[PDB]
């Protein structure tokens, strides 16, 4: 599960 501040916007990889 790839994490970064832009991926976080999809509210899944949190």
């Amino acid at each position: 599960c790839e994490k970064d501040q832009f991926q976080s916007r999809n509210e899944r990889c949190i």
């Epitope: 790839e2 994490k3 970064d4 501040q5 832009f6 991926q7 916007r9």
Partner: antibody, heavy 117, light 113 residues
Framework: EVQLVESGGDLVKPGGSLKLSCAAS????????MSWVRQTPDKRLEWVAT????????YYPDSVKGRFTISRDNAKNTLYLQMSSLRSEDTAMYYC??????????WGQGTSVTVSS | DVVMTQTPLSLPVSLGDQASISCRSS???????????LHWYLQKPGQSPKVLMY???NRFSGVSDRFSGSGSGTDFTLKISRVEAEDLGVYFC?????????FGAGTKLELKR
């Protein structure tokens, strides 16, 4: 007590190349996206690059896309920024930062880069 | 790119008093999922920035509850309820709704004496 320590800044001639490094400590580096942000002599901030936790994705603004390359070594807990085709407007203090949830929570104390003939 | 305009750019305030900073974006910061990715940072003198707030109103762990964030769309506010000497610095708003991530120019909090 997260810690980030940048190194590698220097004077570089226009058209030259330079590699910055950022040593991460006291957190599980592999679980977080990481970013570079620069602060120019006029004190403005400009986001430079981001890389996802596992290195699958990278992101850049047009001002550096193609010329700058972000990478990470999750075994060595280190972040890198390879800079090439350097321009005078790239002169700035460069900060490494940890992506935590939706923003960049902790930032290193920075390393200075000057591009001049 | 999204332009972030902060008001005021210089903010003199007395200790223990209230202060408020405005941040206006050149386009809406509402993301396709209806969330708003507007964040605030503080750069203390001689230091690098540190984050204060994320997604308009959420305090990061370790940030005093004297700080509050509010707003919607293009109009956002950071409020400090009782100013302390350690609040001295430059406050930056930032958006990540639209790539590239952008920052406002900074608002310098100054202590009156």
């Amino acid at each position: 007590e997260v810690q980030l320590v940048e190194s590698g800044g220097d004077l570089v001639k226009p058209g030259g190349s330079l590699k910055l490094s950022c040593a991460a400590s006291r957190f599980t580096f592999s679980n977080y996206g990481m970013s570079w942000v620069r602060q120019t002599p006029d004190k403005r901030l400009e986001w430079v690059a981001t890389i996802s936790s596992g290195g699958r994705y990278t992101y850049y603004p047009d001002s550096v896309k193609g010329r700058f390359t972000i990478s990470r070594d999750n075994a060595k807990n280190t972040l890198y920024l390879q800079m090439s085709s350097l321009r005078s407007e790239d002169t700035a203090m460069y900060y490494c930062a940890r992506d935590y949830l939706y923003a960049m929570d902790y930032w290193g104390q920075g390393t200075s880069v000057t591009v001049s003939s | 790119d999204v332009v972030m305009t902060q008001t005021p750019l210089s903010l003199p305030v007395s200790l223990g008093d209230q202060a408020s900073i405005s941040c206006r974006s050149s386009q809406s910061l509402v993301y396709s999922n209806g969330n708003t990715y507007l964040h605030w940072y503080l750069q203390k003198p001689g230091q690098s920035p540190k984050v204060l707030m994320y997604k308009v109103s959420n305090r990061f762990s370790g940030v005093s509850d004297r700080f509050s964030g509010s707003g919607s769309g293009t109009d956002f506010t950071l409020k400090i309820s009782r100013v302390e000497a350690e609040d001295l610095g430059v406050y930056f708003c930032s958006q990540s709704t639209h790539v590239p991530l952008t920052f406002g120019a900074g608002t310098k909090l100054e202590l009156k004496r």
